[PDB]
Design a protein around this ligand. Structure first.
Ligand code: HEM
Ligand SMILES: Cc1ccc(-c2ccncc2)c(C(=O)N2CCC(O)(Cc3ccccc3)CC2)c1
Length: 429
């Protein structure tokens, strides 16, 4: 092989972790084609903080199409041509301005209040409750309203077919005749929903309804001269999926881990008590004052990044950390791997929020749960605000105990998520 000379072996992220440990900062692997996992901070900096390095489209191909069905296609995540990317990124950026996000505070509050009232009613310390499912309904209900102006009402038990579609498509990215059929139909369903909600927005505008400027406004604008709506739909599916799935799992992971950290939980309860009190509504400014909750969520992303990493195309032969890496090679970056290396993090398996305390030295290119550079998460602040609002309201009102038997392990599709449904029993504070 042109790759035989590179060090390497003569959940998949965990295998990568073991190999990076065993073999060093530049290791050859198999994802889908041969790629090279690069785990030095210097390398992270060089490749992610430069606009000379583009994503590798061959590696995103499994998000563009699934069993011949267009999924993310040429939307904002999976578009690897720089110009095309840059054009749509800059247009859609408008929906994530400071004042756009601040105005979502009402939506975040309402959906979080609804979740908490639903959980309070079950808080008999006996009824098992899937926090993964409940957090996913909350994130979807937030996204639909926030990004598209629609009310899915999943918290109320609506949109079960839609829930099913999502589940089946996620399984499909990582994979008979029958599962093949369930997958295709699901992807087509979600694009059909896209055509549905797009039609409504356009009717509204035509009939001159009040039209909140949101993410949907901006993805419409991005496509002013397209001959068809394929680009538009690509972005619909992208935001629909990216905008809830990882938020949901970040919340779920946080709740799962916190269930064996009672001292940390008591600290979080104290913080929430002291800043917001008994208030039902968190002000934008309150978010800033929840400093310890903010550290907890960061540490949760260190050990449990739902978006595990990214790929860049190495265009020409380059020496990386003493290793010759051939022209035309997918470079694999993983915040999951790096977060669990003792050479980057002291006692890496210890959940310690103090790593992110003010005055603690900041991780320097060893932690990137939203990636870094020009292709970093456009929804970073949106996600941070929403998960802070959900967590703060849970902590205000409820105590959680993981049902015994629930595992701490992971499953890996395209993203990482709890292996188990995070079944908990609950009591009011
Ligand atoms: C905890 C929640 C989230 C995490 C951990 C996360 C993580 C990431 C990561 C690692 C990337 C880079 C992906 C790549 O290089 O292939 C990314 C990009 C992106 N994320 Fe997120 N994300 C989150 C929430 C969101 C939300 C709420 C939205 C939308 C409202 C969103 C939309 C996107 C989009 C559109 C991109 C591509 C942007 C570009 O290339 O310019 N994400 N995210
Ligand atoms: C199904 C799905 C759901 C959400 C997101 C999502 C979330 C929030 N923001 C952005 C995207 C993504 C998704 O596109 N990603 C970026 C890439 C990856 O990190 C790793 C990966 C790269 C290539 C192939 C397989 C994995 C995984 C997450 C994919």
């Amino acid at each position: 092989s042109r790759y035989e000379h590179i060090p390497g072996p003569p959940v998949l992220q965990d295998v990568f972790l073991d190999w990076a440990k065993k073999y060093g900062p530049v290791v050859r692997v198999n994802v889908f084609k041969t790629s090279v996992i690069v785990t030095s901070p210097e390398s992270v900096k060089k490749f992610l903080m430069s606009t000379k390095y583009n994503k590798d489209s061959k590696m995103y191909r499994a998000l563009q199409t699934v069993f011949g069905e267009r999924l993310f296609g040429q939307g904002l995540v999976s578009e690897c041509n720089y110009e095309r990317w840059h054009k749509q990124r800059r247009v859609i950026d408008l929906a994530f301005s400071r004042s756009s996000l601040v105005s979502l505070m009402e939506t975040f509050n309402e959906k979080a209040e609804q979740l908490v009232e639903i959980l309070e009613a079950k808080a008999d310390g006996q009824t098992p409750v899937s926090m993964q499912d409940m957090l996913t309904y909350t994130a979807m209900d937030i996204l639909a309203k926030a990004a598209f102006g629609m009310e899915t009402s999943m918290l109320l038990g609506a949109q079960k077919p839609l829930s099913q579609a999502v589940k089946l498509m996620l399984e499909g990215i990582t994979a008979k005749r029958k599962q093949l059929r369930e997958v295709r139909e699901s992807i087509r369903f979600l694009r059909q929903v896209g055509r549905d909600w797009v039609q409504r927005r356009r009717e509204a505008l035509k009939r001159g309804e009040e039209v909140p400027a949101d993410i949907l406004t901006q993805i419409l604008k991005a496509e002013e001269g397209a001959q068809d709506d394929e680009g538009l739909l690509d972005n619909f599916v992208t935001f629909f999926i990216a905008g809830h799935e990882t938020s949901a799992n970040h919340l779920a992971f946080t709740v799962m881990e916190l269930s064996r950290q009672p001292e940390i939980v008591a600290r979080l309860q104290a913080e929430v008590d002291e800043v917001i009190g008994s208030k039902r509504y968190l002000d934008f400014e309150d978010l800033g004052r929840l400093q310890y909750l903010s550290q907890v969520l960061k540490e949760s992303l260190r050990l449990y990044p739902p978006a595990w990493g990214t790929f860049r195309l190495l265009e020409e032969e380059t020496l990386i950390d003493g290793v010759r890496v051939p022209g035309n090679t997918p470079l694999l970056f993983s915040t999951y791997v790096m977060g669990r290396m003792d050479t980057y993090f002291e006692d890496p398996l210890t959940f310690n929020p103090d790593r992110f305390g003010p005055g603690a030295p900041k991780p320097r290119f060893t932690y990137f749960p939203f990636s870094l550079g020009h292709r970093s998460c456009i929804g970073q602040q949106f996600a941070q605000m929403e998960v802070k609002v959900v967590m703060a309201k849970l902590l205000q009102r409820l105590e959680f105990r993981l049902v015994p038997g629930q595992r701490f392990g992971l499953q890996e599709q395209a993203t990482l998520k709890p292996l188990d449904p995070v079944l908990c029993t609950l009591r009011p504070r």
